[PDB]
Structure 1
Amino acid sequence: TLVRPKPLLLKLLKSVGAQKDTYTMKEVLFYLGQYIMTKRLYDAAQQHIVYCSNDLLGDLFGVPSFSVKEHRKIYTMIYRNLV
């Protein structure tokens, strides 16, 4: 089943090329991954940590940083931004 992103998540996915209004979780994760790489939000010395405190992604997820190794927490954060 497709999901519908809330307006701010949708803005972020659109900034990396997404064109739809509805997505699979696989597509949201992909785009979110592209976004973090493009804006260089990961620590280049400690790659599993994403520092989003001064970025839109911080506003979206409500956290200053997060770990890519904490899979359950990433999905929780994404889910709050889906209808």
Structure 2
Amino acid sequence: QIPASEQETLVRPKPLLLKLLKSVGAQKDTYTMKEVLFYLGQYIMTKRLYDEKQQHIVYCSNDLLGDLFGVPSFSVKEHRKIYTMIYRNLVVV
């Protein structure tokens, strides 16, 4: 679980994360973390990266998301790990 105050942190995605956020129909350059996570979820859906067998795993190898996160897959239940992977791809305002 992520504290409410941290979800409202203002952030500026680096070029690659920004690129994939905009393909999902985020238009802007500055976000709250809550917004980044929403649009990442929408990206995963669009690209069908979530496990079809519903085992709470995203298979991101060989996709831009895998490149950014530096992992072939990850658990959607591990929110702090996800936040950390995202933070490495942005600058806090």
Pairwise TM-score range, normalised by the shorter structure:
over 0.9
**Normalized against structure 2, the TM-score is what?**
0.85
Paired residues, number: 83
The runs of at least 4 consecutive aligned structure 1 residues that moved more than 2 Å come to none
Q: Which runs of 5+ in 2 are unaligned?
A: 1-8
**Normalized against structure 1, the TM-score is what?**
0.94
Give me the CA root mean square deviation.
Answer: 1.2
- Cα shift readout 1:20-46 (whole Å, capped 9, x = no counterpart): 110001110000000001111011103
**Structure showing the higher strand proportion among its residues:** 2
Structure 1 pair 60–5 and aligned structure 2 pair: CA distance change class (3 A): same
3-state SS of paired residue (2:11): coil
- Cα shift readout 1:47-77 (whole Å, capped 9, x = no counterpart): 4100000111000100000000111100000
Q: Which runs of 5+ in 1 are unaligned?
A: none
Tell me the percent identity: 98
